Amino acid sequence: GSHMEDFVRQCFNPMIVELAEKAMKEYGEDPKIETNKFAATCTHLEVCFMYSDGGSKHRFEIIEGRDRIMAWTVVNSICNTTGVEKPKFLPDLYDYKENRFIEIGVTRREVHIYYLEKANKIKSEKTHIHIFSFTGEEMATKADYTLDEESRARIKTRLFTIRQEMASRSLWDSFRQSE
Ligand SMILES: C[C@@H](N1CN([C@H]2c3ccccc3CSc3ccccc32)n2ccc(=O)c(O)c2C1=O)C(F)(F)F
Ligand SMILES: [Mn+2]
Ligand SMILES: [Mn+2]
């Protein structure tokens, strides 16, 4: 029973905790043991939800936070309706305005390294990549940041709050030295 586990449950919203718990277990990871991965999936989920709330009403389809089968179901429906190519790997969102899938990244390292890896692994150049860091840097494909500055700023504020809350509990060092 780790301190990090109790912190995650009081730091994040209960719907977000439960969706992340079900994601871990679906893919074989235990949240009471892999507690840094527990904190990271919650964080990534919250960012995805904040992001999809950043535009107008019907702008984004949310692919993250579903079980494997339904996420791929919604992707197939988006593809066979948009004409957009079917990604090799599950993205997080679909942008009905710009007509493209989005992969959202949250990293504790310099955003450049993490984008390279997601780019290299993405294979599908099709998919737009948006990286956020816990220090306030962001980095997006073709310098196109999709949302306007204020919706991106609130995401960065929340990321820095999570980092401070961890740091006040001595969990940040273990969290950063674990990515
Ligand atoms: C399962 C889906 N994953 C994998 N993996 C994911 C995950 C989920 C459950 C168990 C292990 C892991 C690897 S660790 C991690 C850490 C933070 C946030 C998400 C995650 N991702 C890492 C970064 C992302 O940006 C992202 O979108 C995912 C993601 O969506 C997939 F694409 F493979 F179908
Ligand atoms: Mn995802
Ligand atoms: Mn992602």
β pairing state of 128-133 and 138-140: antiparallel
Instruction: Name the strand (E) or helix (H) holding 160.
Output: helix 149-167
Catalytically annotated residue among 118, 121, 123, 142: 118
Region at 136 (left for phi over 0; alpha for psi -120 to 50; beta for the rest): left
| Ligand located closest to 51 CA | 3
d(CA 57, CA 75): 20
- Ligand 1: which atom is nearest the Cα of residue 105? 25
CB 107 within 8 A of CB 179: yes
CB 115 within 8 A of CB 96: no
CB 38 within 8 A of CB 52: no
| Tokens 């995805």, residue located | 48
Nearest CA among 4, 11, 72 for reference residue 32:
4
| Active site annotation includes 118 | yes
Nearest CA among 140, 164, 115 for reference residue 54:
140
Beta strands in 47-117 (DSSP E): 60-62, 93-95, 100-107
d(CA 42, CA 28): 16
β pairing state of 100-107 and 128-133: parallel
- The domains of the chain are located at 1-179
CATH classification number, 1-179, choose in 3.30.1780.10, 3.40.50.1700, 3.40.50.620, 3.40.91.90? 3.40.91.90
Helix (H, G, I), strand (E, B) or coil at 94: strand
Which residue's C-alpha comes closest to atom 20 of ligand 1?
Answer: 41
Q: How many CA atoms lie within 13 A of 22 on its CB side?
A: 12
